Amino acid sequence: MAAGILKQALAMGMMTEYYHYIFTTLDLFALDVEPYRYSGVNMTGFRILNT
Amino acid sequence: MAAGILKQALAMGMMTEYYHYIFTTLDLFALDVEPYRYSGVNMTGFRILNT
Structure with missing residues (x-):
């Protein structure tokens, strides 16, 4: 859902x-974060997988 | 060139x-204007082809 809602957010001028x-x-x-890392949005979350 | 520069302008948060x-x-x-007509940018030009 998050991958999907980000695309819509980009279309909407809300990834800045x-x-x-x-x-x-x-x-x-x-x-996939390639479409968004150059834009300046802030995305924060958590990760339990110990990579 | 114009088709190409518009894609870059979108990536850059400049189609608003x-x-x-x-x-x-x-x-x-x-x-192809499908990627841009919902965004609110203003694009104006001329057309001599009498469609």
Whole structure:
């Protein structure tokens, strides 16, 4: 769902330095983040997998 | 070139209601505009082809 909602957020001009998103999911690290890392959004979440 | 520079402008957070782009090209009408019409940017140009 998070991968899906991010695409919609991009389309909507909401992936910028103005927005900060906290993600509840522990599988945050599984998300393709290539489309968003250059934009300046803040995405924070948690990870229990000890990589 | 215009099709190409628009993609870069989107990536850069520059296809929004704040920006107005005038295009010199007469083939403006040939551009896939599906990625940009919902965003609020202003794109204006000319067309000599009498459609």
